[PDB]
Structure formats: structure tokens, C-alpha cells
């Protein structure tokens, strides 16, 4: 029960003229495909070219890359006289629309398409063209040495060519993006006072409906909805409070202090069917000083503890992250060494499990992290 000491006003008048607002209709928007089709219409194609262009633009993703191979498109046309070279010509024509480089098969194609539209006066263009055309994995893997051998070029020219490479656009289709992203309103709040975490539902999201009972059946049915809503929010609050009580240590000391709890614990604690617990916690979030977390985030698997008990997979992931974050660049830690290092604190996880956790956290293996 506090008052927000700062905020943003809403741009509108407090009172509206008494006439009723018109029914909501909507408003059209321009996505990438709409722009591409608009440019297609104003382009001197034939009829078959226009059909192939429609089929191609249909299969362009949000980033502007062509998701299907050309065989799918030529099959989708449904004609037999049309060959694959016509599809190639139409695709090459489409790839030069605005933004330049859209509908590209892969990154190499996009970069080459963008590079082909420069002027010859550019200081280092042929070097960049050759590097993209032939030796790309060398630039990605940060070799900088065998690339010097193959290119037969000194340091300065290669550095400038790489500077030109990192000046292009790898996602040309995201210039025309969505207007404004959505945001989620939290359902419950967990504050702390008296050394304890208080749990309370969002007041700004829970109004009390006016009871329409004066014309009095219908009154009893209306009260049934009230009782159902009461029971629903009571169940939500009880489940959230029990979950917060179980995971007290995490709320204080952050990660590496969760407990391996499953739906059975909640079902036995609140005396309810586990299906109801699964139903109520789906697509609902809680706001903590640490962030916003889905109500189902605290359930996970476990691993055996040598001294006794179990360790949350979230704690293992956090420990792996913190161990990797403080490794030596000269000799990055490997999976077996990581397992050996963690097998001193009672953590007993197989090498396969460590690999799965590392893949989940999206960290490159040791050989790609060496400096």
C-alpha cells in the first residue's frame, strides 16, 4: 500500500463529449511483405514473373532471408515449361529491392549482394569481395593468421577490409520492423518487510464489480460468478504464497539457492489436484525486485547430492556460468575439466549433462574461446 512518487501523464482530455465513441475497426500496417509486394507491382514483369515473385515474397521471414529452397518455389508454381534459371533471374531482381539484400539464401549471399552495389572508387573492395567469396569461416573463427597466408596481404589492408565487412548489414529486413513491442503486466508482487517476503495480488489489476441486483434467478447466477472469481483468485494467491515460502533462499541470495520442487510438493501442500496446479501457474508472472519471472520457472529437474538431498538444475547452470566467467583466456576450461572441478563440492553430474547445460546456456566450447 504505497503511492507511486513519479509517473508519466496520458495524452488526452479528462472528459469526452457525451456522444458514444464509434465501434473499434482497426488500422492497416506495412510489414516487410507488403512493401516488397508494393515494389513488385510497380516493376515491369511478365505474368509468370509476377506469379514467381508472389511465391518468392510469400516465403520471406522477418529478418529478410529466404526460408525455402528454390525447388520448393518451382514446384509450387505448378508449371512444367518453367525452369530454375527463370526463378534465379526473378530472385536476383527481387534481391535488389529496398532494403538491398533482402530474400538472400544465406549470410554470404546477403553480404555479396550488398557489396555488389558499391562504386569502384571504394578503397578496399576487391579484398572484401574475395574474403567473403572464398574464406569466410576464417574471419568468423578469429584466425587472422592463416587468412594472412592465403590472402598474401599485410596487416593494414586486411584490417581495413574487415572494417568494411563489419560496416554492412547482416539483417537487412529488420529496418522495417514492428511499431512498438508489447509488455506484460505482473499478476502478483513479492515485497520484503520484517525479514519476510510478503505476497500480494496486483491491486491495479483487480477491481471489484458493481453488484447489479436492484431490478429484482439472475441475481443468484450473478453471485455464482462472484464466488467463482473469489475461488480463482484465492487459489492463485495460495499457490503463489506457498511457492514463495518454499523458494525463500533464492529471493534473498539470488541464483544457486533454488530447491528442486515439482508439482507434487505444491499439490500436497495446498491439498489440490496437480492438474489444477499445472493449469493455474500457466502463463502467469510474478514481479520481484530481481526482475519478472514466470510462475512456472521455479520447477525443474534435480541431480543426486553426495552428502544427501538434491541440487536444482538452475543452480548447476548458474554455477557453470560463474565458473566459465572466471577462466583463463589462454587455456579455456573443457567439459571434463569442468566436471572434475565441480566434483569437489558434492556436485555429481555426468559429462553428457554438463554438455547439455552448456548448450542450453549458449556458450561456445573451449577451442572457440581461446585468446
Amino acid at each position: 500500500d504505497t503511492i507511486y512518487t513519479a509517473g508519466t501523464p496520458s495524452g488526452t482530455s479528462g472528459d469526452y463529449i457525451d456522444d458514444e465513441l464509434p465501434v473499434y475497426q482497426g488500422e492497416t500496417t506495412q510489414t516487410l511483405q507488403d512493401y516488397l509486394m508494393w515494389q513488385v507491382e510497380l516493376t515491369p514483369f511478365s505474368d509468370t514473373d509476377r506469379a514467381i515473385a508472389t511465391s518468392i515474397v510469400d516465403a520471406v521471414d522477418e529478418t529478410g532471408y529466404l526460408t525455402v529452397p528454390l525447388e520448393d518455389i518451382l514446384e509450387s508454381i505448378g508449371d512444367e515449361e518453367i525452369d530454375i534459371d527463370e526463378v534465379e533471374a526473378v530472385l536476383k531482381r527481387i534481391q535488389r529491392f529496398d532494403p538491398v539484400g533482402v530474400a538472400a539464401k544465406d549470410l554470404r549471399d546477403c553480404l555479396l549482394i550488398q557489396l555488389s552495389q558499391f562504386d569502384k572508387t571504394t578503397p578496399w573492395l576487391e579484398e572484401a569481395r574475395l574474403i567473403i567469396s572464398d574464406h569466410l569461416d576464417l574471419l568468423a573463427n578469429h584466425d587472422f593468421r592463416t587468412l594472412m597466408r592465403v590472402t598474401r596481404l599485410k596487416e593494414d589492408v586486411l584490417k581495413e577490409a574487415v572494417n568494411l565487412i563489419q560496416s554492412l548489414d547482416p539483417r537487412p529486413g529488420q529496418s522495417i520492423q514492428t511499431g512498438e513491442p508489447e509488455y506484460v503486466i505482473p499478476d502478483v508482487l513479492v515485497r520484503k518487510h520484517n525479514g519476510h517476503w510478503t505476497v500480494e495480488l496486483n491491486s491495479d489489476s483487480i477491481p471489484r464489480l458493481q453488484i447489479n441486483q436492484h431490478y429484482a434467478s439472475n441475481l443468484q447466477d450473478a453471485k455464482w460468478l462472484i464466488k467463482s472469481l473469489e475461488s480463482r483468485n484465492d487459489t492463485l494467491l495460495r499457490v503463489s504464497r506457498c511457492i514463495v515460502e518454499q523458494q525463500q533462499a533464492f529471493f534473498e541470495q539470488g541464483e544457486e539457492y533454488m530447491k528442486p520442487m515439482v508439482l507434487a510438493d505444491i499439490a500436497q501442500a495446498v491439498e489440490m489436484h496437480e492438474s489444477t496446479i499445472s493449469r493455474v501457474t500457466t502463463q502467469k508472472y510474478l514481479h520481484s525486485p530481481r526482475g519478472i519471472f514466470e510462475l512456472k520457472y521455479f520447477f525443474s529437474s534435480h541431480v543426486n547430492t553426495e552428502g544427501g538431498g538434491e541440487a536444482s538444475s538452475t543452480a548447476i547452470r548458474a554455477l557453470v556460468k560463474k565458473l566459465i566467467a572466471a577462466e583463463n583466456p589462454a587455456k579455456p576450461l573443457s567439459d571434463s575439466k569442468l566436471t572434475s572441478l565441480l566434483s569437489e563440492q558434492g556436485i555429481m553430474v555426468a559429462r553428457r549433462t554438463v554438455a547439455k547445460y552448456r548448450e542450453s546456456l549458449s556458450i561456445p566450447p573451449s577451442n572457440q574461446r581461446k585468446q
Binding site: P44, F45, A89, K92, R93, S116
Partner: protein, 50 residues
């Protein structure tokens, strides 16, 4: 002899060009579309007297 004259030619006109098979026409369309052009444009006051 110039890019403009080739550009102004429509596809139906070049289809009926003798000794010019459809493969060559598709290749010409490919090389034009690579640079951002197409067959069937229309320009006024051509040639530019040069």
C-alpha cells in the same frame, strides 16, 4: 550498342529475334537483374545525342 537500347526492348520483341533462343534471353534478363534493371522500361528523348 548501349544499355538503354537493350533496356527499352520488350520481352516479346526479343523472343521473336532470329537466332536468339530462350536460354540467351533468360541469361540477358539475369545479367540485367543482377545490376537492378529490367526489360520493358520506357525513356523519352533517347538517344542522348552521344
Amino acid at each position: 550498342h548501349y544499355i538503354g537500347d537493350l533496356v527499352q526492348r520488350t520481352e516479346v520483341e526479343l523472343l521473336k529475334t532470329p537466332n536468339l533462343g530462350k536460354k540467351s534471353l533468360t541469361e540477358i534478363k539475369d545479367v540485367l537483374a543482377s545490376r537492378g534493371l529490367s526489360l520493358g522500361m520506357r525513356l523519352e528523348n533517347w538517344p542522348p545525342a552521344s
